Amino acid sequence: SSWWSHVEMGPPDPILGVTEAFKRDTNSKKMNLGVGAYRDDNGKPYVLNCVRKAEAMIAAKKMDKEYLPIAGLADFTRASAELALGENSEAFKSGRYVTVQGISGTGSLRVGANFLQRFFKFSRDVYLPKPSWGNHTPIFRDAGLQLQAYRYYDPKTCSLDFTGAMEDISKIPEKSIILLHACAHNPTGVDPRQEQWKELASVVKKRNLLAYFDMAYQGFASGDINRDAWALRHFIEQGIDVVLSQSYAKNMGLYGERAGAFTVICRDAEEAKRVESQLKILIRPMYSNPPMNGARIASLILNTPELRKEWLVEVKGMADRIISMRTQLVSNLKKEGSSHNWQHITDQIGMFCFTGLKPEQVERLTKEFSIYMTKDGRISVAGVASSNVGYLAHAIHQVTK
Amino acid sequence: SSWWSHVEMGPPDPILGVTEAFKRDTNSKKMNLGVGAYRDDNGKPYVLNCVRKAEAMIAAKKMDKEYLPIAGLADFTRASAELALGENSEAFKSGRYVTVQGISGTGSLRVGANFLQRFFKFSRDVYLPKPSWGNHTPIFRDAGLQLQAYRYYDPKTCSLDFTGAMEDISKIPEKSIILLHACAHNPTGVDPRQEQWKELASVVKKRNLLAYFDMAYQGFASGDINRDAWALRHFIEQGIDVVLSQSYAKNMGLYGERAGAFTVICRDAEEAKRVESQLKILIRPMYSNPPMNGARIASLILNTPELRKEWLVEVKGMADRIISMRTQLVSNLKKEGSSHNWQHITDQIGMFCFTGLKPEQVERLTKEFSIYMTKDGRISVAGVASSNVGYLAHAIHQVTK
């Protein structure tokens, strides 16, 4: 009936552009630094051992495929909160939080956005760091909220614009919403240091802002689950009742299984139950109940001492590899006689690194070196291996010489 | 804080209540007729054999857990469209359809609803049959659409108000959206006969309405996948470009794995691509990408001749047990000396049956017999077994005599 003749072709994904060209390249020396998931030293996808084991365990138990409660798997949501807040957290012990399973971090972010749109009467403004993960915009926008921003990244030093951040935040109308990356800021890799987080907390507290933490790399950033959750935990201790989204896509390599959760810190256990009833109401008409596989896998790992223990080592190996690559990249640039300051590379944390390379330098690296990345100078450290770090150091040097 | 002080407790779920009250029951003869999923003759959850086999196949291959494209697993989307439309369908063969993996049937319905709120400029109204599955309301409402209704179920006859439907649909504003249950109407079990479907197709065509099919029971209703998709296929052949949602929850017993899909029938292959593009932009900010497990299983079964073969036998087996229970319930009621007309029980299709019972009687059944069901007189036939059917009939006789 020509119902859709007016539907226009959506704009193409740039990252997709990068991956495709990479795919077309025949030079065996090509590098894909546009990659969004972890890759091993051999440039291959990695399913943790503990994951294989957990999977085998489920298979062994001949479990049913019955619908999970709207809120998800209790063993999973509980373990998830404990993971984030800490076993001895006051918030945890008193049971004054409500955690619901979501469709990975994304779905959890969205549920949260929809929850705020509905019940957070104080404001519609959500302040994002400049820049932020691309998907954050439309998540909040689609949810019916308004987007604001605070200075974060400093192009000058490829570090944190602590001054701008603090000035921006100090002017945020009371009771507004501020989004913070728990650790391993995406896409810059620039995170505040402890002393800086202590200061941001003080202002967020003072200005009575609702803090929304996006925690997609717990344990994957520094290889330590406690350290990665430090800032989130610190806010809550200072009396800031945050909202939070967790993803296991990276830390457990559950990517496609979509395991994640949304958590609200409440005043007491009673209030938590009320909030939880409302989240159930929101979710039902969204997708009814959550996918079971990823949650079943995560819960087993988290709740099985042997698995959990093994997980920590594994997540640590992942973190270590990335760090080692940052280290080696810096070292090789020196060996190459790069007069430039590449400290930011080692100061940066996680999978993403804002290099400082200009659009033109990027082109050259692509055109001449078969090294693929986006024009923002952002590199996925996951695409770097022991075998090519040398080459990359080399190539970067040539275009910056 | 005190951000949530004003968030109040949500309304208690009924279906939820019967289940729990059911559990808290000691009568060894107790029955739960509120169950929303298939149960075998022993009252146990049933995981399909073909499903266990697909899983063993996946396990053996040691697959990665890498993100699926936004639109989901291609083998899955295609197989899915093929299942629905049929192998020789012109719509299928020409590629003038677009299918995206959704979070089962509900997430597919939601994506579909969000898509219409966005691009279906012709109207904001969605007409649901009277009555419709509970979830249908908030799905559309939350999507930003307006709900309307059309007469469907005839309480006087516990059958279809064909005349009422026809007059309602004939008076629906042109270019409005009309939701139709493909087969095994939930919650009444009342479906139009092939002949009535022809007539409905005609009015829908003439009024130029956008028909949105909800197909959650393909193969599960009659034991025949082709017969179950008859009405869908018929509309399409008549030149009605429908939109459709599929669930593999019931027909494959994939309940918690959440495998489903949303389909749009377009003018051409070209339009389908434009449409797909926009569906991707919509889904990204919802949940990023879909759960991989259920889609992997479903894809294996549909694409592997031997598994697909076994699947058809098992669905048939499920459908037959339900039909048998309907049959036995009626025979037992007669035998018991019941003078009431219970033909509706056998005329109805699927797992849900509108008994016609009255509240006070439902109450009686619960109180005196330990038979749990919702006060709407609806019973899940899945809860009936060969070993309790006699009990149920006896009880129903008693409260109705």
Ligand SMILES: *Cc1c(COP(=O)(O)O)cnc(C)c1O
């Ligand atoms: C990974 C990521 C998410 C969520 O990803 P999922 O695959 O949906 O779990 C959210 N925020 C950031 C910053 C991320 O990097």
Ligand SMILES: *Cc1c(COP(=O)(O)O)cnc(C)c1O
């Ligand atoms: C089962 C059902 C759905 C979707 O169920 P899911 O669990 O989300 O797949 C949609 N419509 C009707 C009428 C249903 O019975």
